[PDB]
């Protein structure tokens, strides 16, 4: 069972195999992120085909603290649920918490009740843990204070948090921004804009975080919280007609469809001569040996020797089983296994006796006739889906 968790900055730093930070626009198309583009080279892995490219992540040095937008409720409840704890190592009963919606940003508010009187020396733990910025009712709570109060966790708090159903991680403050690989290539434009904003703000930093810096520590948060946050192989579809002069388990197939699609089967000892007399007359298309595939087109002057390790796919002939899929119908009876029949026309022959299990009239309906590939799938379709 897969388990979800939060991405802490240390985990992003460990996952990031590159040591250099991404600061320039041209660094997004470098070589250590795989080969999803049409032109370029790789330095990390070097898998030349796109089917082997998995992608490599990255990180951006971001020294500014940003709150997690969609996890403000989790922090709210985790801060409201804890009992009153004085000393975190190893008058505060009426404390309340609220939020302010300032330009879309969800900032936490530590507001005191109006019935209580304000005292400059109260909450000495907040004073020793951080400097009091706002001496009024509006106090901007910086994420550093939250990280500092949440860094040292006692045993009882750990037990109660593991019992309630949550767990705090070092990922609420985004310090290392994970950058997705180039497998995807407006998101790129927003990434470029936010990169320009963060580099401008970093160039506009001088000293510790004060009011003169907090006045410029706003647009970043607003830009963060404003806009920053299957097919199948085998297939066949054609018009179906009526044919009541054949068995119920027999269904027709055109020439080109039977010529294109094949049926995979492993080489056995009981059919040593049959496979040879089928492969010498050039009816098969290709054959796979180990991890490489060899075609059966014109150009081979050497005889195709039989080997149990070399798998072959035989063209569908009388003796193959297939199941069909109809327009959506509640009944599972619509899916059925029928033997294939060879003919010269291009349409499919369906007897009128199969109209009650299905729902397709001969008025122009379309079906989806599939092909089993594995021999286990062959047994499954011949035993379960059979009439």
């Amino acid at each position: 069972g897969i388990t979800f968790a939060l991405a802490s900055h240390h985990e992003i730093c460990i996952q990031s195999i590159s040591e250099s930070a991404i600061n320039h626009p041209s660094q997004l198309t470098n070589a250590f992120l795989g080969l999803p583009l049409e032109f370029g080279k790789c330095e990390s892995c070097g898998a030349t085909e796109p089917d082997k490219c998995e992608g490599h992540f990255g990180y951006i040095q971001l020294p500014v603290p940003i709150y997690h937008p969609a996890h403000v409720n989790e922090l709210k409840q985790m801060l409201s649920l804890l009992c009153l704890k004085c000393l975190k190592i190893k008058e505060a009963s009426q404390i309340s918490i609220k939020d302010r919606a300032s330009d879309g940003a969800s900032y936490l508010e530590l507001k005191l009740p109006s019935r209580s009187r304000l005292q400059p020396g109260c909450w000495n733990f907040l004073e020793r843990y951080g400097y009091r910025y706002g001496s009024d009712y509006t106090r901007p709570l910086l994420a550093r204070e939250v990280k500092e109060i949440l860094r040292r966790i006692p045993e009882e708090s750990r037990k109660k948090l593991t019992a309630k159903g949550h767990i705090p991680q070092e990922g609420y403050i985004l310090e290392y921004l994970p950058v997705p690989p180039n497998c995807l290539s407006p998101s790129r434009i927003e990434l470029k804009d936010v990169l320009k904003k963060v580099i401008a703000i970093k160039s506009s930093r001088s000293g510790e975080t004060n009011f003169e810096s907090h006045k410029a520590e706003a647009s970043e948060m607003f830009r963060v919280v404003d806009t920053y946050l299957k097919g199948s192989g085998f297939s066949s579809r054609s018009v179906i007609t009526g044919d009541a002069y054949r068995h119920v388990n027999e269904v027709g197939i055109p020439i080109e469809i039977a010529q294109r699609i094949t049926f995979e089967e492993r080489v056995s000892v009981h059919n040593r001569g049959y496979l040879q007399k089928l492969v010498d007359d050039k009816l098969c298309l290709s054959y796979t040996q180990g991890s490489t595939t060899y075609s059966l087109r014109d150009g081979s002057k050497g005889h195709t020797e039989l080997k149990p390790g070399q798998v072959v796919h035989r063209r569908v002939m009388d003796g193959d089983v297939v199941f069909i899929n109809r327009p959506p119908t509640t009944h599972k009876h619509s899916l059925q296994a029928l033997r294939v029949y060879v003919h010269e026309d291009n349409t499919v022959k369906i007897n009128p006796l199969m109209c009650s299990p299905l729902s397709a009239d001969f008025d122009g309906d379309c079906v989806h006739l599939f092909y089993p590939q594995s021999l286990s799938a062959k047994a499954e379709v011949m035993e379960l889906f059979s009439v």
Partner: protein, 50 residues
């Protein structure tokens, strides 16, 4: 069924998931489906008669 972002973030903040064998994982992660031919029964080979 509904907007995937809210349920995904809820599962992320929950961080508690048990080992279950429903349709989830069998059709999205490649796990063997636990109904039909892939139900709870094994095929250990016996050496006594062979």
């Amino acid at each position: 069924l509904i907007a995937p972002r809210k349920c995904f973030e809820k599962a992320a903040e929950k961080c508690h998931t048990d080992s279950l064998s429903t349709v989830v994982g069998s059709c999205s992660w490649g796990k063997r489906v636990d109904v039909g031919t892939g139900s709870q029964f094994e095929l250990l080979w016996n050496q006594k008669e062979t």
